[PDB]
Chain length 388, copies 4
């Protein structure tokens, strides 16, 4: 009755997560840098399936074409030695001062062209390493003040950028899809496409919408006070959940990036329930930061904790849905009726159906209790392993 | 140099706004009810263009077909006497206990059919009164707990509802469009389609998307900590801003519905700037509540205040955009460059353009300051009428 | 290994909690009213220790002196029949329209005098029924706008009110203490004494500070995004935690009043840990609302759930502190060193101690990891009953 | 009719504000470092009264006693050359990795002793430079997880630290007072003494309370969604506002530190109104950050903007309080009655006064409107300079 991860569980980590040195807006690094090769090795030992990277995590900004080759070759050798995969890659368009007003929607046109070239270069690298998903997080696309950015022009520029990227992968014959990662704020005062919904809407305006989906992050939707499982359900409904980032957040404040399971524990339970129920089959990626209070031992403890907490929640959610008492409570709360069409009989039969209105007993309907609290206490008992 | 509204300004109010009696979750009504006919009269005297209604604001729930006719005829006479119009109408699907688990996405199928019949009935009434926009606010669509609602099934049901409504207006030959009004929470723990972005995305999945747009509300996006002007810009970009609701909100807390201009005053300034600049031509609707501390004199003072504050902001934003010093600062901050295509030369020329990457001087670009703070202080001076 | 409450567990409920009819700002009551006598009976059957009341919960506003006697006598008989106690009482100074601008700090002086008389009358009643704690929640003390309330004058008035109440109980020889209940907002735009800290500070300015403490509520501090267990620790440190209100809240939004255990589950765990560890011996009072989706069966299910979730958390926290692996991790994280004085040797020895500064090896100290993540994963394993 | 600051206006800035290089959690510095001597010079040219510093802003961490002397002597010469004063100083106990778990409440006892020695050393320096106020911001005192910190022990340690500091300044005969600066979160998950109220309460438990007050910051109380002017009024009421930090914040999110006037503009108006009305006579200190989008020209523009926006608000608030129409509206809203004692006649006369209860006409009182909306629209007109 234990919780050891296997590469079959598809757990992945970014190089930048366990390799975060602990620098925050008020303080210096508390840990030395990690060689990517060591991270790949340590993570493989913990049971992880693969790793992800920003271009600049793997190849130091300003590297010569040959230094580049050397960096990649060592990385590739660590992957061969461990069996680790690289399912996703992304571009760093936020750290260098040149991106201080954004990458794809910077006001300066020459910066936007440069942002696209830096991206295209890394897409080729990611296809070579086998990635299937290319993520875009526009961390610097946004503003601190109202006049600094015309948002209709900036969306035109954002669409222009993504359309060109889609032209490029289709012309090269690459099999890779894009995933946009929303965040409402930080480091910009307000960021463009702030939530899963804004990114889903945007995508429908691209030339080839089928090439793009979303990469939602637990803590990001919670920084807007939103229900993350609800957001994920809408993305699944639209057919657009191409990737997901897992972590923990305690409410509306700075982006904490705690390990998965920390923060809002019940939201984590309902998220795992939904992913496993909908048969989500992509990576379970952790975008998190071991607190700067920790040494390297606490770093690996924190990474193990991410995977452990997913597997415990997976087991409690599976026990909840398999419990006959729970299946009866779902029927008592009429979840089965929610799944049936309101009016498969069609508009005309509905208009002619007097039991839908003229003779509907509104008082008897209103008196029916929904029985949601007992259902929710059953879900609580199961999460806490208190089923008696 | 004053600020009197005229019916040309297209200011509208819901019957439920100035007619709110002051009941809140912790206290009794502090004001008597208003006859709709008196509200129409008082508002006409204040300079308003028109009024809006929920079915149940105008016709008491449970009214006989003849009481109904009487209520409508008196209303129509007040409109004829004053020249007031009715540009928008909506359905009350949230007050009656029968809607306690929602209208279109209630778990009980018979409640969902009833919700659609109650709606269709009011669409006919709204077309008779001349409305051009039919608003839907699903205030009860949502949940307090994770197991109570499968969100993929509920979105199926929501889409089913809106598709049927669109079939009905097209079969009747009615010229009316729908506008969905998002809200993140309250009165449900979490509400479905919580933000402008989620509603825009949803619409793209309907059978006839062209029939539907959004009706965003200032306070609702701010209850999620989001930038309302940014949200409106995205709706304008998508061609979907069919209506708008104006009011004030002080941050993330219960829905305050203060008069427009109250709450976040700078957001109000940038919103007015954007609406007038984009040539938004629909109603300027106020969805607000005079505080329950007030008597009827304070009610009409609060309603006048809404319109006054819009006209003052309109004048300050127009002065800001006409100021030659501001047009020069916009150029200094490269807003003009934001509006130009990144790569009208096409993908291949970009890939071959060495100044976009191989020979891009990243250090010189990064050193360019954006000059946003002086621009923002110019916007502040103009808002405060302190231009010297 | 089960979780049945007994009157020894000191669980109490307000009449207004299970008796809430479901009216919210957007909808009608969904449940009939409960007779106080039935609530006392049902709660006794569930294992509760006692009940609490507002004056107006027990005696309808505007009751004649004799109707009053009748209401009290029936109540007293239900208490005798069940063994239930009344440890706390409070005043309703927020529902009647007369309190729309507050009770003790209303701008109208005659309303403030009336507020004090209504209070004094109920203190006598509470002493007769045996209450030991008199709670004050100034739900209407505050403002929607900046000019409406001078806050220094209002604090003068608040202090005046509480000093007079203390003069009265000391002159009558009553053994009862007062507890102030903070809330940051709702129903007023901002409420005075918004958090536990503001109320603790205020008390130190009263004539007889020893007579007053706080009654913090889980959801209220969380509506300000604060850490409720931290807040409770500060109140315990000051010797001022005279009572506590338990419930659940999902983040910063309207006051949800969910059952205890719902909302932020980890905060609930750390709260129970602290109360049991500090030996808090007052009532465990639930101030919560069964969702309006529920019928009376769901009401009693929700109330049982409050007590069940406390007892489960109590058992997991006790298991955590008794676990030898956890006691070793606490030592590894230096919690033992936190409890020792920094400088019991005194100022002069510290100034003369060169190992505190001149010869302190700052680099070796900084490299020590705090081991907090493993400790926190041990706390998680224990909460989820996953200890292996 | 313009807005030029003079040293009489008592405007001050921290060295760390205009000298912030632009490093944030996601990106590199965008500006070179500033020599303290140049900042003192540039600020003097802008009209500032003085500067403040952390020990480590002025003397690089790890400096020899002689390098120290050199740094101080150049600084002192810049002060002599410009006439600038140093009214406040503070300690950096948050940047160095040694303070990763706090300074005064770190779990490691040797770190806490070192924190006190680093502090005492800087108090002597501050007294030499003439400061009157010594500020303490415990940015690292707090936790990311529940078990990492026992908050009652940590408050014991915090009190121990401040008592020793007070023993030291009294034994040295120094005339300097302490001011504690609260913040609810960031960089720790939750920080101890999170709001003005918590710090006021804490102080009352110190050995010599009269030596300590608060230094509230606009953005910090707003990160908890609180009303900053209300908070300042409570501090003034307690006699404890020894210093204040001014800046701008857009709601509940990461600490933005925008220039004063940005963020919530109406809160800024009511704050200035209160400070000038209560005769606050300390420094008007700006703790803010010029956005990293800016070059040095935008840095000085942003600093000028702080002072300009204070002087504009000062003029609008003074015009509001001097307006006879406003004085009449204050009387109409009964602000004059708020300032009168509720019961100067005493408890016994109140108990015997039948007009306070037996014969109080509650219905007539309730019908009185408070007239707050017209008052608030007068305040808006004055702020926008739209008085007609
Ligand atoms: Ni994040
Ligand atoms: Ni609203
Ligand atoms: Ni509450
Ligand atoms: Ni700050």
């Amino acid at each position: 009755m234990n919780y050891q991860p296997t590469p079959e569980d598809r757990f992945t980590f970014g190089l930048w997560t366990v390799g975060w040195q602990g620098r925050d807006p008020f303080g210096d690094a508390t840990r030395r840098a990690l060689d990517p090769v060591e991270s790949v090795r340590r993570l493989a030992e913990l049971g992880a399936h693969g790793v992800t990277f920003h271009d600049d995590d793997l190849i130091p900004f300003g590297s010569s074409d040959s230094e580049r080759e050397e960096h990649v070759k060592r990385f590739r050798q660590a992957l061969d030695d461990t069996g680790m995969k690289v399912p996703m890659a992304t571009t760093n368009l936020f750290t260098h001062p040149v991106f201080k007003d954004g990458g794809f929607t910077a006001n300066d046109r020459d910066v936007r062209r440069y942002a696209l070239r830096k991206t295209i270069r890394n897409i080729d690298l990611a296809v070579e390493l086998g990635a299937e998903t290319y993520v875009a997080w526009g961390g610097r696309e946004g503003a601190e003040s109202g006049g600094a950015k015309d948002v209709r022009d900036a969306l035109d520029r954002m669409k222009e950028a993504f359309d060109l990227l889609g032209e490029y992968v289709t012309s090269q014959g690459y099999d890779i899809r894009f995933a946009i990662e929303p965040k409402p704020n930080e480091p910009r005062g307000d960021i463009l496409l702030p939530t899963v919904g804004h990114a889903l809407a945007f995508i429908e305006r691209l030339e080839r919408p089928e090439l793009y989906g979303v990469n939602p992050e637990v803590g990001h939707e919670q920084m807007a006070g939103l229900n993350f499982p609800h957001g994920i359900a809408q993305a699944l409904w639209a057919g657009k959940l191409f990737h997901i980032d897992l972590n923990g957040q305690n409410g509306i404040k700075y982006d904490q990036d705690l390990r998965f399971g920390a923060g809002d524990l019940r939201a984590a339970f309902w998220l795992v329930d939904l992913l496993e129920s909908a048969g989500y089959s992509g990576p379970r990626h952790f975008d998190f930061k071991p607190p700067r209070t920790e040494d390297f031992d606490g770093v690996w403890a924190s990474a193990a904790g991410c995977m452990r907490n997913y597997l415990i929640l997976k087991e409690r959610a599976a026990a909840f849905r398999a419990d006959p008492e729970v299946q009866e409570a779902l029927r008592a709360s009429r979840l089965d009726e929610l799944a049936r069409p309101t009016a498969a009989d069609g508009l005309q039969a509905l208009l002619d159906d007097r039991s839908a209105f003229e003779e509907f007993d509104v008082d008897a309907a209103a008196a029916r209790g929904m029985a949601f609290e007992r259902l929710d206490q059953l879900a609580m008992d199961h999460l806490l392993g208190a089923r008696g």
